[PDB]
Amino acid sequence: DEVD
């Protein structure tokens, strides 16, 4: 999970 990573933020855009």
Residue numbers in the entry: 384 to 387
Tell me what the authors wrote about this structure, in their words.
To gain insight into caspase activity and regulation in coral, we expressed and characterized two caspases each from two species of Caribbean reef-building corals, Orbicella faveolata and Porites astreoides. Two proteins referred to as PaCasp7a and OfCasp3a based on sequences similarity to human caspases contain CARD motifs at the N terminus, an unusual combination that has not been observed in caspases-3 or -7 enzymes from higher eukaryotes, and indeed these proteins function as initiator caspases. Our functional characterization suggests that PaCasp7a and OfCasp3a may function similarly to caspase-2 because they exhibit DXXDase activity and contain an N-terminal CARD motif. We also report the first X-ray crystal structure of a coral caspase, that of PaCasp7a determined at 1.57 Å resolution, which reveals an N-terminal peptide bound near the active site that may serve as a regulatory exosite.
